[PDB]
Ligand binder design. Structure first.
Ligand SMILES: Nc1ncnc2c1ncn2[C@@H]1O[C@H](COP(=O)(O)OP(=O)(O)O)[C@@H](O)[C@H]1O
Lengths: 371, 56, 56
């Protein structure tokens, strides 16, 4: 029977059926709760909205992402998210559906453990499995070799794969992603006079970032240009009129990914972590990796990010290797696409964790090669 | 006593390096403005479309 | 002796000339995309003011 593919991630839950071509349901992974008291009796106001419902009721709620950096911190809201997904987004009894779950590399072991335990006790699925987001994103790209640079909303990791083999000693995870870019934009938007502090209007800032921001091919030139001219200013209308205008910020914000010092982090930029991950691999496979940089995740969707990425990593690499960057136009869903592809296989139909097996061996079965 | 080909082919390599230098340099110089125009169209498409909906 | 380095030098002459050819090809293709993208941007950008004044 059909299998489910629920890619949790931060910021965006995307679910659907195995074998399909795109996730059916996509909604923000948030849980809102009213913060005023409510006076109209008979309104039967529920006590906890979730998903697009909360995203619409933003004005009177307090939103809580239950996944901070790839890891689940509030298990009750995560259970609400899963329950809502199954029973309303897909409208399917999870009793007879093996489900595929994803998680970033180098996560707390207890994360996937408790995840499996909940999936088997609360929802009582027949089987399940936890996969690495980067492997799936490589599946979707029709490749079998190449570093994959997944950069979701909470975490950013590189995974070098060659001939279907992963080199775990070179997996480089970095905790800078879309949420931090949103916060940095909220900060630097003050110096124009705009102040967004509410968890509700963090979403407004996220929309501004998704629409206007872009990566500059050369930071200094773009800075000097925005100084001289005004051909970079663009306006934007807030949910109550009062249009705003942002200039330098448009490329100041996503520049962080290449200079984490802007937000006070010490690690190297994206290009540099990529190059390092390359250099940690064996010398014989570095050319293919140079040729097969893959990009997934919504944060890699800035206009111009691939070009700047190529320029930087070209500057770092020798001048005789060829640098390419595989940026499909739907890369935001490459993880879910790869998940559907893998779940549709039959050579995979014996890698699931059968509920009987888990009852026999406990949630420790996850780390066991019944992965 | 057969070094003439050595000299000639060394100079061949030098001038070929010069030619690829110039060629690829102006090549990426072109693609910079190419992707510039790509951003131009990707922007003004959106702008024309939104002002068009405003007109509607 | 030096004849074998001469052999390798001739071979690299070949492949470098090939690189020059690929460079000129990508140059010409870049100018082609330049002409096309310029036609498109120019055709689609000079009209914003029309919708503007109409809705105005
Ligand atoms: N068009 C866009 N431009 C820039 N950033 C975007 C765009 N679309 C989405 N994002 C960012 O990417 C994030 C969504 O990425 P996603 O792959 O869903 O993360 P996850 O895998 O953790 O769910 C959002 O938080 C948003 O900030």
């Amino acid at each position: 029977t059909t299998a489910l593919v629920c890619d949790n991630g931060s910021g965006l839950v995307k679910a659907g059926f195995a074998g399909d071509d795109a996730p059916r349901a996509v909604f923000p992974s948030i849980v809102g709760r009213p913060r005023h008291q409510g006076v109209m009796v008979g309104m039967g106001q529920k006590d906890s909205y979730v998903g697009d419902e909360a995203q619409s009721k933003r004005g009177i709620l307090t939103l809580k992402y239950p996944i901070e950096h790839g890891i689940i911190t509030n298990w009750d809201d995560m259970e609400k998210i899963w329950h809502h997904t199954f029973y309303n987004e897909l409208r399917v009894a999870p009793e007879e559906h093996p489900t595929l779950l994803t998680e970033a590399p180098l996560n707390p072991k207890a994360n996937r453990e408790k995840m499996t335990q909940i999936m088997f006790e609360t929802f009582n699925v027949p089987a399940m499995y936890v996969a690495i987001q980067a492997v799936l994103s490589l599946y979707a790209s029709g490749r079998t070799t190449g570093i994959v640079l997944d950069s979701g909303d909470g975490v950013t990791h590189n995974v070098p794969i060659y001939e279907g083999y992963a080199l775990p000693h070179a997996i480089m995870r970095l905790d800078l992603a879309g949420r931090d870019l949103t916060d940095y934009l909220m900060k630097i938007l003050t110096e124009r006079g705009y102040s967004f502090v509410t968890t509700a209007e963090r979403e407004i800032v996220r929309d501004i970032k998704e629409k206007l921001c872009y990566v500059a091919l050369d930071f200094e030139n773009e800075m000097a240009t925005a100084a001289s001219s005004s051909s970079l200013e663009k306006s934007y209308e807030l949910p109550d009129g009062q249009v705003i205008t942002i200039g330098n910020e448009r490329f100041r914000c996503p520049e962080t990914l290449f200079q984490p010092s802007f937000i006070g982090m010490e690690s190297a930029g994206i290009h540099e972590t990529t190059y390092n991950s390359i250099m940690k691999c064996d010398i014989d496979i570095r050319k293919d990796l140079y040729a097969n940089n893959v990009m997934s995740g919504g944060t890699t969707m800035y206009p111009g990010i691939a070009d700047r990425m190529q320029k930087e990593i070209t500057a770092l690499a020798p001048s005789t290797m060829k640098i390419k960057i595989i940026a499909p136009p739907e890369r935001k869903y490459s993880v879910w696409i790869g998940g559907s592809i893998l779940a549709s296989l039959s050579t995979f139909q014996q890698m699931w964790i059968t509920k009987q097996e888990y009852d026999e061996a406990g949630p420790s079965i996850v780390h066991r090669k019944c992965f | 006593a057969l070094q003439k080909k050595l000299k000639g082919t060394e100079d061949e390599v030098e001038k070929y390096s010069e030619s690829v230098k110039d060629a690829q340099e102006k090549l990426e110089q072109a693609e910079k403005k190419a992707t510039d125009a790509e951003a131009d169209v990707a922007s003004l498409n959106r702008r024309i479309q939104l002002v068009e909906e405003e007109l509607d």
